[PDB]
């Protein structure tokens, strides 16, 4: 069930308890919000979710509300870390969920081989990962509408948010993200995770 969009507390980034969670902290991207909403927390540990906003950005520009999400897995032999942002709205529509995937050759050597970024029903792909889109090993992502909002790769510097990973959530939060109706938007790291990795795959 919903609570006010500006009353979802920021889930504090915990210490990484295993190599999966440490990898997701290591590869946390930067985001450059060119226009529209800042990223907000979408869920709290009790499983309450953001009510979002009716469809400028004055109700969704508070930098203190920032949150980023991730979930990790494998596909076709590669290691994928999906990072995902929720915005209270994208005339547009209530709610917005977008994601990028950082592809590693495997979790041991952990070389970035490709990046994917959600745009409408598909993904932009950078294969091999263009070094102008990387600040070290930190991917530089843009959030912008020219058409509703889409992610992209950018040379511009961006901002980072406290990260709470799927693997670190309470069961009540994972349950809420699986079952909640986000309307025109869809959580991309729930039970559709592997299906999304297929769509994001770079070959
Ligand atoms: Mg969207
Ligand atoms: Mg591996």
Residue numbers in the entry: 1 to 55, 59 to 93, 99 to 154, 157 to 213
Could you pull the original sentences from the published paper?
A multiple amino acid sequence alignment of HaNLP3 protein with several toxic NLP representatives in the region between these two cysteines pinpointed a few possible amino acid residues that could affect NLP toxicity: Ala64, Asn67 and Glu71 in non-toxic HaNLP3 and corresponding Pro41, Asp44 and Asn48 in toxic NLPPya. To determine whether slightly less toxic NLPPyaP41A, D44N, N48E displays any structural divergence from the wild-type protein, we determined its crystal structure. Except from the triple mutation, the overall structure strongly resembles the wild-type NLPPya structure with Cα RMSD value of 0.3 Å and 0.5 Å for chain A and chain B, respectively (calculated by DALI). Interestingly, in the NLPPyaP41A, D44N, N48E we observed another variation of the Mg2+ ion octahedral coordination. Here, the Mg2+ ion is directly coordinated by Asp104 and Glu106 and indirectly by Asp93 and His159 via four water molecules. This further highlights that Mg2+ coordination can adjust to the spatial arrangement of different NLPPya scaffolds. Notably, the NLPPyaP41A, D44N, N48E mutant exhibits a limited flexibility of L1, L2, and Lc3 as compared to the wild-type protein, in line with its reduced necrotic activity. The mutations induce the loss of a persistent H-bond (between side chains of Asp44-Asn48), which in NLPPya firmly links Lc3 to L1, affecting their flexibility. The loss of H-bonds linking Lc3 with L1 induced by these mutations not only reduces the thermal stability of NLPPyaP41A, D44N, N48E, but also affects the protein internal movements. Furthermore, the NLPPyaP41A, D44N, N48E mutant, functionally and structurally characterized in this work, pinpoints another important structural element to regulate stability and functional dynamics of the protein.
